[PDB]
Amino acid sequence: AYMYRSAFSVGLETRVTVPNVPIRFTKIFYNQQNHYDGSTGKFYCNIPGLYYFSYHITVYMKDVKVSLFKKDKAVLFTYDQYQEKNVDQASGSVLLHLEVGDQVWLQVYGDGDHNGLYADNVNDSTFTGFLLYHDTN
Amino acid sequence: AYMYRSAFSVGLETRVTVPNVPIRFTKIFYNQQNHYDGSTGKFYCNIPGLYYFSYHITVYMKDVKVSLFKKDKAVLFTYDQYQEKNVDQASGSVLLHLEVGDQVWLQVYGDGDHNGLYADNVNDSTFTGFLLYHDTN
Amino acid sequence: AYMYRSAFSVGLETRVTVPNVPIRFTKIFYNQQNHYDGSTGKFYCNIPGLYYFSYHITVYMKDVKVSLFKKDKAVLFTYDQYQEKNVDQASGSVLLHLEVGDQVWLQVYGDGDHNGLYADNVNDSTFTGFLLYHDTN
């Protein structure tokens, strides 16, 4: 007996250094409905309703700005004013009503043409989302 | 066909500098049931049950302490020790069981009578909450 | 009528200084089904399904690494790079599918043998989780 379900939880373990593009998380904690696509780093709404989104990422670059995108524009914009060195750790959560076809993803902005020396890492960056409430009916 | 639903997600983009008062988030990501009131900055429970709350805010002041209030007292107290440059970015999440009429809001405390020069900003601070489980019945 | 429900939200206020062991949160914001055991500091899955987990903790030690465990292995590994003052404030969220018997808990690692002088504190660290989707049936 079918139930309107949609959720995904994905990570990176590190590498976030490319700006202006959708961050493509490939570590899958959960993506049963395959509504999230690691090839594009985008979540595709296949069920209209209220979704909850949450992310915790580590960005390796200077003056980092994080944007959570819905459809084609930034709906959430993070600019941690407490950025030290060339590493930024941003997080956020929000509820977004989505229609079928609506896309949601994360994107970073900043300078990485002058990054110091890397390190061990093994630090999980995550992007999660799930359908809270299915629309009308 | 009615369903016990209650959720809200609101932000500010910036303005939080006044302490001791409910932070009035006015940017509405979601507030369909209008259980959140931007005039008071408080969420009003209209359905008894278990609620999840989550916030990510940036506070412009020193020696900042953040409190999530339920009814009339702080249930969550955040005093990040990682403060420096008079810019505190506190976050938190918790599950609270609420009864009809219970109010929930965020409140900050600190010294804002010696803040340096501002900046571009454009940094979303958010307050989100949703009914997870409706009570008994 | 029975509803497959399972959620918990617990905190500490301060203490986390001992590494390698499951953090025992004892402040109960919610633990109605008693699925979280404050004695062992572990959540026990009593209902198979999709769970959302969220945590915001403050660790008092140096070179702090944080791990969210599922059953016996670390699922999430948080190694905040912007650490200082021997105080690490880590947070994370993720969705995990669990089977009955599966245990989930938080554990920290790091050097706490030589920490500086404490302070007021009163800083709520939290560990929360809830069943999102009950399994098949």
Swiss-Prot record, chains A, B, C:
Its main location: secreted. Synthesized exclusively by adipocytes and secreted into plasma. HMW-complex blood contents are higher in females than in males, are increased in males by castration and decreased again upon subsequent testosterone treatment, which blocks HMW-complex secretion. Polymerization and secretion of adiponectin is inhibited by succination of cysteine residues by the Krebs cycle intermediate fumarate, which leads to S-(2-succinyl)cysteine residues. It comes from the Eukaryota. Residues 1-137 form the C1q domain. Homomultimer. Forms trimers, hexamers and 12- to 18-mers. The trimers (low molecular weight complexes / LMW) are assembled via non-covalent interactions of the collagen-like domains in a triple helix and hydrophobic interactions within the globular C1q domain. Several trimers can associate to form disulfide-linked hexamers (middle molecular weight complexes / MMW) and larger complexes (higher molecular weight / HMW). The HMW-complex assembly is also modulated by the degree of lysine hydroxylation and glycosylation. HMW complexes are more extensively glycosylated than smaller oligomers. Hydroxylation and glycosylation of the lysine residues within the collagen-like domain of adiponectin seem to be critically involved in regulating the formation and/or secretion of HMW complexes and consequently contribute to the insulin-sensitizing activity of adiponectin in hepatocytes. GO terms for biological process: adiponectin-activated signaling pathway; brown fat cell differentiation; cellular response to insulin stimulus; cellular response to xenobiotic stimulus; detection of oxidative stress; fatty acid beta-oxidation; fatty acid oxidation; gene expression. Important adipokine involved in the control of fat metabolism and insulin sensitivity, with direct anti-diabetic, anti-atherogenic and anti-inflammatory activities. Stimulates AMPK phosphorylation and activation in the liver and the skeletal muscle, enhancing glucose utilization and fatty-acid combustion. Antagonizes TNF-alpha by negatively regulating its expression in various tissues such as liver and macrophages, and also by counteracting its effects. Inhibits endothelial NF-kappa-B signaling through a cAMP-dependent pathway. Induction: During hormone-induced adipose differentiation and activated by insulin. This is Adiponectin. GO terms for cellular component: cell periphery; cell surface; collagen trimer; endoplasmic reticulum; extracellular region; extracellular space; perinuclear region of cytoplasm. The gene is Adipoq. It is found in: Secreted. Keywords: Collagen, Disulfide bond, Glycoprotein, Hormone, Hydroxylation, Repeat, Secreted, Signal. The chain holds residues 111 to 247 of 247 of the full protein. The record marks N123 as: Not glycosylated. One of its GO terms (molecular function) is sialic acid binding.
